[PDB]
């Protein structure tokens, strides 16, 4: 997939987990294809840095929001949606890249509190944030809501504990949303980045040589395709960046 | 499936949600096929009634435990496992029938608090209880751990919100567990009861005529098959009571 440089021109896209890794890559890449990108993350100064990088390249500084998905309330999610609604007439896209890995190890050992934290970030807060942004998404001529999945969201595997559970939940919640919007202007889908050179991947696989992995840059074609009009007939699906 | 009347003779099986509906049916039916049944539920007097019914038929009163999955802690789950361990040398089976439906309606409207409650009962507390009982399950010559799923745990559908999300999570968590135990003495699987004559079904489908549905009694063959040795080679699977 090699789209024109103005695929996303004027499309307003919110990118969560934007501080580093695949989230930062997608924010940069979406801005480079003409998007008006809105960044969301945990750390204010780390967001400022990504936004400044886009400003250095596009010459308009992206707006950012700090939101801690672990601790956020429904009302805090509504505050973000209210703040976006005050600056923009619509969202054309929402890419959820934020996620917590939690503990890798056997179910006999999984820490209950960490397990609850994984569910809270990956499922409940991602839901709460989504719900607050649905009205803005429906203002798009062709809105696109994307969740982050994993191969362990399709087939559970030993030691993947809360993470795998939360990615199965993410496929389910994506399928509910996609069915509810199916004949309307909003499409909803998941992306499995596959093994990619990130700190999360290295934490799970400390022996692996990350230099043998594709980078976040390498996997961008799929991320671009789901936000652009070439994917507009596709909803309810889960895609592998590296099949 | 028509097994001998002593299929489950002397097998010690914990049944959650045992106060009414499919949970109460399975507790009765397991006792009738020779099981030593342990009941778990919310209401003490409702449990006493089911246990008394089994005592009236088998002449030994089942032990019961009150546990509120909505509010229970890891330590409360460990207290149950400790109390079972003090009376019994093993668990031969654990059937999780407890579940919360939460709200049926569109994702734009799902109440966040109810959504969190559904996740807490159907996923996190069911996990916590499971983890606390794994050592007792491993003492069985052929232990069987069964989760309750739904057709909306395999394919998401409009208006199924937190419930569908939590049943996808339940398939994932069942697949992790099944992979971790695959070459050991514990098998792990899900059951989808299908549309059955219960208060949960009627709440979701108020127009439907429940008298046209199979009862919990009708769907028991599968519940019996998964606790008996005829299923001992099957793990990681999700079964429909009514295909
Ligand atoms: Mg390391
Ligand atoms: Mg267009
Ligand atoms: Mg009613
Ligand atoms: Mg036997």
UniProtKB/TrEMBL annotation, chains A, B:
Which residues fall in a coiled-coil region?
Answer: none
Note whether Nucleus occurs among the keywords: no
Keywords of the record: Metal-binding, Oxidoreductase
Short name of one Pfam family for this protein?
A: adh_short
InterPro entries hit by this protein: KR_dom, NAD(P)-bd_dom_sf, Sc_DH/Rdtase_CS, SDR_fam, YciK
Source superkingdom:
Bacteria
| Family in the record | Belongs to the short-chain dehydrogenases/reductases (SDR) family.
- What is the name attached to this protein's record? Hypothetical oxidoreductase
């Amino acid at each position: 997939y090699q789209p024109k440089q103005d695929l996303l021109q004027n499309r307003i896209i919110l990118v969560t987990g934007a501080s580093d890794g695949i989230g930062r890559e997608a924010a940069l890449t979406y801005a480079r294809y003409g998007a008006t990108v809105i960044l969301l993350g945990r750390n204010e100064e780390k967001l400022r840095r990504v936004a400044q990088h886009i400003a250095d390249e596009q010459h308009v500084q992206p707006q950012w929001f700090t939101l801690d998905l672990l601790t956020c309330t429904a009302e805090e999610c509504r505050q973000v949606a209210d703040r976006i609604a005050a600056h923009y007439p619509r969202l054309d896209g929402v890419l959820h890249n934020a996620g917590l890995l939690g503990e890798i190890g056997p179910m006999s050992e999984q820490d209950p509190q960490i397990w609850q934290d994984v569910m809270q970030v990956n499922v409940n807060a991602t839901f709460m944030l989504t719900q607050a942004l649905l009205p803005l998404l429906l203002k798009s001529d062709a809105g696109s809501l994307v969740f982050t999945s994993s191969s362990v969201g399709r087939q559970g595997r030993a030691n993947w504990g809360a993470y795998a559970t939360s990615k199965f939940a993410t496929e389910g919640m994506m399928q509910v949303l996609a069915d509810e919007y199916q004949n309307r202007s909003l499409r909803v889908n998941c992306i499995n980045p596959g093994g990619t050179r990130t700190s999360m991947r290295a934490s799970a696989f400390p022996t692996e040589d990350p230099q043998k992995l594709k980078t976040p840059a390498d996997i961008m074609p799929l991320y671009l395709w789901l936000m652009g009009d070439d994917s507009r007939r596709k909803t309810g699906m889960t895609f592998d960046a590296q099949p």
